[PDB]
Amino acid sequence: VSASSRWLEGIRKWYYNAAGFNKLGLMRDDTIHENDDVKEAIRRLPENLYNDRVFRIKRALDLSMRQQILPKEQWTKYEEDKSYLEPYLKEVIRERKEREEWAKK
Amino acid sequence: LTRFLGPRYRQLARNWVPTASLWGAVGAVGLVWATDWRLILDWVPYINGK
Amino acid sequence: SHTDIKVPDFSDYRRPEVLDSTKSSKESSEARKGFSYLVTATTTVGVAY
Amino acid sequence: RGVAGALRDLKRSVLCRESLRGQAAGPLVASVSL
Amino acid sequence: TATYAQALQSVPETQVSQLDNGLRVASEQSSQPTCTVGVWIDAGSRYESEKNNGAGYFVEHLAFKGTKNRPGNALEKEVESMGAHLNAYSTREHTAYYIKALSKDLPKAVELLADIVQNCSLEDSQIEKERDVILQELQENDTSMRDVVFNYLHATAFQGTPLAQSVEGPSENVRKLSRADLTEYLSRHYKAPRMVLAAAGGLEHRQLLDLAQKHFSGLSGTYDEDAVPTLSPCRFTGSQICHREDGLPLAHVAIAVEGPGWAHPDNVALQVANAIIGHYDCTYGGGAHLSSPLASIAATNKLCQSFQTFNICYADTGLLGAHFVCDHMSIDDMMFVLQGQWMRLCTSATESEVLRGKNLLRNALVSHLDGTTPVCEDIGRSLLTYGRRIPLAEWESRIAEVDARVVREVCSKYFYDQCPAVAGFGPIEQLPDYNRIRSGMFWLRF
Amino acid sequence: VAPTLTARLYSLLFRRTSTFALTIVVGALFFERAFDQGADAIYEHINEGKLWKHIKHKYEN
Amino acid sequence: AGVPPHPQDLEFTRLPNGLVIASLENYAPASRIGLFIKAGSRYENSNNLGTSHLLRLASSLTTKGASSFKITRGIEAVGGKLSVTSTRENMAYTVECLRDDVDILMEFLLNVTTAPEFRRWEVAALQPQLRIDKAVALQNPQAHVIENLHAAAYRNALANSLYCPDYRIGKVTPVELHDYVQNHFTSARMALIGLGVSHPVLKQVAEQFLNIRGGLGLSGAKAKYHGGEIREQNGDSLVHAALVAESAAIGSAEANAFSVLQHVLGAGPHVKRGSNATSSLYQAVAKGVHQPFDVSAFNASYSDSGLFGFYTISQAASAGDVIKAAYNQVKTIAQGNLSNPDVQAAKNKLKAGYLMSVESSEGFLDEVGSQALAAGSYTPPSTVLQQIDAVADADVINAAKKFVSGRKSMAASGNLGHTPFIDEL
Ligand SMILES: CCCCCCCCCCCCCC(=O)OC[C@H](COP(=O)(O)OCC[N+](C)(C)C)OC(=O)CCCCCCCCCCCCC
Ligand SMILES: CCCCCC(=O)OC[C@H](COP(=O)([O-])OCCN)OC(=O)CCCCC
Ligand SMILES: CCCCCC(=O)OC[C@H](COP(=O)([O-])OCCN)OC(=O)CCCCC
């Protein structure tokens, strides 16, 4: 909407490229630490996203073993990073918080 | 973190309170008896001696 | 045929307070439990000493 | 508890003619609960 | 609109009268075109000796098979032709015969009940017929693991007493019970003061009392020549019975402690506790999300096909506990979780879950007394046990008293550090040893 | 029909594990005094005037 | 004096969108509500068999206003109940609770029926329940006989099973459940029934939350009777068998004649352990059969069809003898050998049985709910008994004539070595 919230994105694009998981062809949600909430969200993914997530992670563990990265052409662009897991994950948390609010009635 | 503060959890606290204060009596008395802590054992009447 | 079953008599092993099949067992439930748990308490006393 | 009615774990066997009356069906219904 | 409290006052009070000979006549009027009337009797296996056990069950087979005024099948014809239904049952303490019929058929229905009780044919040829029938019914019952394991619970828990006996009696007694044994049972136990003529439906209490004085005047007077059955107390025995049978696909377990009795106020609070634990089988919908931890865990981890809590009442005693059905490798886990919930309610019951158990009992009570038959049953039974009808307004009051402190005090009184009775049947190699079961009845942390 | 001593001990001390353990630790404390008191009294009554506790009065000065 | 109050009258309303509301205020301590829908298994086709079964198991799944967790815990906290009963014609969502908590359970009932989400994973976890639920039902040999009986009788619609076919378990999709509720849970197909609730509340609820259009108009997918037979050779100890012919659709006067004919022949026992002296079929079979058996008239009446006949249980060797003895006994009635005292006795049983079936709230609510869907009206019992009394003895005979001469349907299971085919009768 403005120029101030636009360099805010510029420093988030900066941190994104510095974090460097896009150099392994990975997306932000591929790097989330699996807890009980996350393991449930992954369980709920449709077959296409689950299989894609499996291969991207497998491709990255392969690269990490060789201490290599993908060509710059194949890095995950900050603009094209689909937060595919947070919708499922946010509903998992929402359900858990409901149980927790009932548990103290 | 704050899952455990609400109506039911303060009821559980008040249910197990009488028990925990007794296990503190077991431990405290057990600590006095094992180490022969003389500062406490003087006021109790019968054990006074040796 | 499972109604032909009857539990055998245990009077050779029952304690005195129980052999009366027409007297409640709850009248002696606290004295009988207390006697067996008194054995345990005095045992741990000696191990404690 | 689930139900199936129609008269208007090894379960149990039927042998005599007195315990067999009431078994012949007389339209099915299927019910489910919590 | 009307509230729940206001609706409980709107039930008509059961009108109660007593005849000159001892019989008690009780009715709850409604606006129904149908009704049920029946006779409830203080009779059952607990009154029988080992030598005539199973007699009253023999009588049940013969009650509808003929009478002096309507011999043979004449009794079936009369009720079937007026569209009525005729039934009976026998527990260890109570015996009942009742009819469902139109309200206009009440005077004939009362007449038939009177003719069944008083004037019974008992032809020696019908007996020999009903003898082979009962033996077949016994072979049938042997395949109901549920009915077996509860007869086993009674057998071990009340060993040495009349309550240990089954209602049906042993096969040996069936084969030698004579007509003299049966008439002796009837003449002793079927006396006016120990009976209740209960009715429920569209009918004025005046009418029911008139028919009682007409068709039940011939009963035996108040005195009975000094030979009254006085039920002695029945010793409860902490004990265990295991019938190992690995050829059966699923194991049945029943476990209980001694309960107070019929007219003890503790039963209310106990029923609230049993409702928290509740019941379950594999066809329920809730599964993981059920309130009861026992239910939720059993569905999630698949520890059983079904379980149910119970509070079986008798005079000055009872059986309080649970029963379940599971795979042979799940018995230990089921008993662990079961006992853990008993212990948890003894020591740390919370107010919220007790409100749920209270509401579950409220719902269970109203919806059970829905229809002419279950009201007439509650009339008849309640007068043999409480000596009066307890209105729903009173039951609600005895419930609202219950809070978390009440269930903890009441449960500890009957569950905590008490010797249970256990009964097992099926592939029960993994059934925990009795000492392990007995140690599950207390918590070292408490 | 007053409950015997064993029944009143159970109702008051043993039913709860905590109170059951409290009286073990207290039972140990008072048992220790009276046992070493009485036991030592036997060991020396047997060996009266045989060891230093008895002849301590001769060589005071 | 100890008398009951003025019994209020049932109130009834038809909204212009087709929805039906019926309420009664019995001032009872508990309240019962039901949403009856024309969505039974007849409305499945051969590309989505079993959808209405899985739908019947999915009432506790997640809706838009209530998580799966909240439905289960909300209802149980009040001690209430939520049930789903299904016929080949209707589904019935029933709710029970104390009258102070009707607000809560109505909200749950509406979310289940109006706002199910059918989430892909919840549906997936539920498919194994079909196998369990069907396995329990088929523990009764009657269940598979009746299912096979309808599959042999009809070409479509009523041929469909209440229980999901084995090949469909795991394959019922969330889309099929969505389409099924869209096509069948419409105002024109629904009835909202309530005991212990006032009529203005139900009407308000109905106008606000149960105005759903579209889907499928009351389709004329007429059940086409066909006749046939299905034979299941198994290792049961007894042979169960049913023999029927097309009879009469419910509501018509011919159906009342069939109901009366049922109680002439023998529907069920009225006395415990009795010989059933007034059961025409039982005595007919018992004459030439001195082994254990059972026999009962079978009557099933549907919106556009019906099946009538009898149902037999016998030793495998006595199968045909029991069948043929039962059939000849019906032939006797078709030949006009029927006394008038036997009809007045059957009308007594049927009248008495009907009133008994509506003593309780659950039986009363079911009759009102199914009356509303089948007939669009409520018919009090005094008028029902009038319609029964209007049955003449010739109507009963003609009903038995329609059975003898009509194309038959048979289902049997057991050791069928001595169980006749249709053409051998
Ligand atoms: C820093 C200083 C701290 C000092 C702390 C002092 C604390 C002293 C100990 C007190 C703890 C008492 C706990 C307790 O008694 O429970 C343990 C079990 C339970 O006995 P049990 O009668 O099964 O159940 C009692 C149930 N109740 C409470 C409802 C009546 O009781 C028994 O069963 C125990 C009896 C056997 C004891 C022997 C074990 C030692 C190993 C073997 C010794 C000989 C060869 C090495
Ligand atoms: C953690 C190990 C404890 C070891 C203590 C020890 O060895 O014993 C010394 C004192 C003796 O009591 P006191 O009255 O002579 O007092 C002498 C004072 N110096 O006993 C105590 O005071 C017990 C205190 C325990 C606290 C954890
Ligand atoms: C310092 C205190 C340690 C307490 C150990 C303990 O109580 O173990 C369990 C059993 C008795 O409990 P339970 O088996 O009845 O189970 C109760 C279930 N609620 O006791 C024994 O027999 C174990 C012997 C240990 C010897 C090393």
PDB file of C-alpha atoms in Angstrom, chain C residues 1-8 10 14 18-23 25-26 33 37, chain E residues 142 148 151-152 155 159-161 166 169 171-172 233 235-237 258 414 417 438:
ATOM      1  CA  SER C   1     -24.625 -76.619  32.252  1.00  0.00           C
ATOM      2  CA  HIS C   2     -22.527 -73.765  33.638  1.00  0.00           C
ATOM      3  CA  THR C   3     -25.230 -73.498  36.330  1.00  0.00           C
ATOM      4  CA  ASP C   4     -24.134 -76.926  37.616  1.00  0.00           C
ATOM      5  CA  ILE C   5     -20.939 -75.162  38.716  1.00  0.00           C
ATOM      6  CA  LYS C   6     -20.578 -74.357  42.397  1.00  0.00           C
ATOM      7  CA  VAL C   7     -17.604 -72.681  44.055  1.00  0.00           C
ATOM      8  CA  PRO C   8     -16.002 -75.159  46.503  1.00  0.00           C
ATOM      9  CA  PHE C  10     -13.011 -72.509  51.561  1.00  0.00           C
ATOM     10  CA  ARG C  14     -11.143 -68.610  55.846  1.00  0.00           C
ATOM     11  CA  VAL C  18     -15.755 -64.624  57.669  1.00  0.00           C
ATOM     12  CA  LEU C  19     -16.958 -68.243  58.004  1.00  0.00           C
ATOM     13  CA  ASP C  20     -20.504 -67.079  58.813  1.00  0.00           C
ATOM     14  CA  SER C  21     -22.076 -66.971  55.349  1.00  0.00           C
ATOM     15  CA  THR C  22     -25.049 -65.063  56.852  1.00  0.00           C
ATOM     16  CA  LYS C  23     -22.921 -62.294  58.430  1.00  0.00           C
ATOM     17  CA  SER C  25     -17.935 -59.248  55.613  1.00  0.00           C
ATOM     18  CA  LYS C  26     -17.767 -55.445  55.867  1.00  0.00           C
ATOM     19  CA  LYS C  33      -6.941 -55.283  56.398  1.00  0.00           C
ATOM     20  CA  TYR C  37      -0.940 -53.954  56.859  1.00  0.00           C
TER      21      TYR C  37
ATOM     22  CA  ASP E 142     -24.003 -71.605  27.937  1.00  0.00           C
ATOM     23  CA  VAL E 148     -22.272 -66.914  31.935  1.00  0.00           C
ATOM     24  CA  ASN E 151     -23.583 -65.973  36.854  1.00  0.00           C
ATOM     25  CA  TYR E 152     -19.912 -66.597  37.656  1.00  0.00           C
ATOM     26  CA  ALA E 155     -21.276 -67.507  42.203  1.00  0.00           C
ATOM     27  CA  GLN E 159     -20.233 -67.963  47.611  1.00  0.00           C
ATOM     28  CA  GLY E 160     -21.919 -69.984  50.352  1.00  0.00           C
ATOM     29  CA  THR E 161     -25.152 -67.953  50.298  1.00  0.00           C
ATOM     30  CA  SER E 166     -28.539 -68.859  39.487  1.00  0.00           C
ATOM     31  CA  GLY E 169     -31.070 -73.633  38.881  1.00  0.00           C
ATOM     32  CA  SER E 171     -29.497 -79.145  35.397  1.00  0.00           C
ATOM     33  CA  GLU E 172     -29.730 -81.775  38.143  1.00  0.00           C
ATOM     34  CA  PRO E 233     -27.723 -61.191  54.912  1.00  0.00           C
ATOM     35  CA  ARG E 235     -21.660 -62.651  52.797  1.00  0.00           C
ATOM     36  CA  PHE E 236     -19.633 -60.977  50.058  1.00  0.00           C
ATOM     37  CA  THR E 237     -16.295 -62.672  49.353  1.00  0.00           C
ATOM     38  CA  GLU E 258     -19.952 -54.932  47.298  1.00  0.00           C
ATOM     39  CA  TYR E 414     -16.932 -48.694  48.317  1.00  0.00           C
ATOM     40  CA  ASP E 417      -8.778 -50.533  49.216  1.00  0.00           C
ATOM     41  CA  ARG E 438      -6.083 -56.153  44.384  1.00  0.00           C
TER      42      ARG E 438
END
